[PDB]
């Protein structure tokens with residue numbers, strides 16, 4: 001589980017939680033209050049609490065004295081499985097016991113302040129057999145289910161810090177109660193089974209009414225509460241990343257612990273006749289395809305081109321500068337303008353470069369060496385103006401770029417997936433892919449369609465780890481879709 005994350009606690013509350021209710025090896029994670037956008041990993045080690053900083057400017061989670069990761073669940077799973085890796089002075093910190101949160105705020109089914117009539121309305125319009133929710137009653141709670149068709153309300157009593165349905169077991173949290181009756185459903189006298197199948201959808205909005213949702217999420221924030229509910233669903237996305245762990249593939253990853261899922265990785269068949277099949281790249285299939293990948297390493301430039309050629313990709317979206325903050329984000333994998341270069345068995349020519357305000361377009365020609373008939377044009381769209389930290393203050397530039405990328409891809413008959421990359425290939429990459437997926441819904445289906453932003457992100461996140469990194473990018477995605485519909 002992801003119960004070790006406590007969204008609404010202070011460093012003091014965290015210290016007292018570990019020192020009174022935990023042991024040596026106990027830990028929890030929490031958002032930082034001192035600098036929002038950041039996280040803190042509080043660990044109990046020899047009767048004392050250590051608070052460790054986790055940073056995310058949009059590319060990955062960067063734990064002080066540790067490594068860079070795609071999700072907090074990936075970070076926690078790693079350090080709990082691989083010991084001696086986390087260090088203070090250099091003292092080996094061990095994560096042994098997650099100290100669980102009882103706060104139901106980040107749960108999909110928790111609604112807090114809500115009326116039984118409004119809960120009945122939502123379950124009537126947006127609900128199906130098994131749809132349920134938990135809301136505040138006088139210090140008590142209410143479980144409202146849909147069965148068909150009807151709505152049943154079950155009182156949840158709060159007696160001396162424990163929860164019950166009026167008999168049987170007394171739970172230490174609403175989640176323990178909810179989970180219990182999910183596995184062991186309450187049966188009504190006349191045989192009705194109160195099936196807790198799925199939480200009620202609170203995120204799907206009609207495209208045309210996005211402005212109303214943006215306003216509502218901008219009220220004390222709602223964006224933060226919505227994002228942290230999506231974040232909580234990331235414990236379901238811990239798929240294997242075994243291939244990316246192989247000795248032979250270690251130097252093929254830009255970040256040691258940010259790996260591609262095995263079930264979606266782009267497998268390379270070109271094959272020089274040992275382990276010629278790996279690239280830190282994943283296929284992104286909506287519900288037009290993409291490949292989400294990292295910025296090239298000097299040793300992966302060749303694999304990059306074997307992939308572009310294999311997949312029949314005709315468009316590349318680069319969302320980083322080669323160098324940001326004095327650090328190399330992506331090596332130059334393309335030739336200089338008018339030059340011709342050989343990258344292993346692959347040959348590329350930079351025919352022409354066009355510089356627009358927010359980006360450069362490079363017309364590339366790709367072919368396999370010794371076969372002239374294999375030649376195809378690859379359009380490289382390189383976004384140059386993304387801030388080193390955070391998101392652009394206005395989404396127009398990104399929307400204009402994405403519009404051009406869209407129409408180029410659309411004009412090319414039988415073009416393979418769109419290649420999208422930044423540094424790690426999870427934050428800016430995930431942001432551009434998600435904006436593009438949602439704005440494609442409003443392209444085909446028009447302003448009258450239904451859009452569900454965290455449903456889309458979760459779907460993309462099961463395909464590559466940590467796709468869309470921060471709450472800032474998440475807000476940017478809302479702001480981008482809203483600007484598209486406004487200019488429609």
Ligand SMILES: COc1cccc(-c2nnc3n(Cc4ccc(C(=O)N5CCC[C@H]5C(=O)O)cc4Cl)c(=O)c4ccccc4n23)c1O
Nearest residue numbers: 077078079081082085238239240241242245256257258259
């Ligand atoms: C259906 O579920 C799944 C089924 C099968 C595999 C996985 C799976 N895939 N990745 C991981 N990781 C990430 C990871 C692991 C190792 C290294 C690594 O470099 N190695 C290798 C040499 C030294 C060692 C080391 O660094 O100590 C780096 C990373 Cl990021 C974990 O932690 C992990 C921990 C508990 C269980 C599965 C894990 N799991 C899985 O999720």
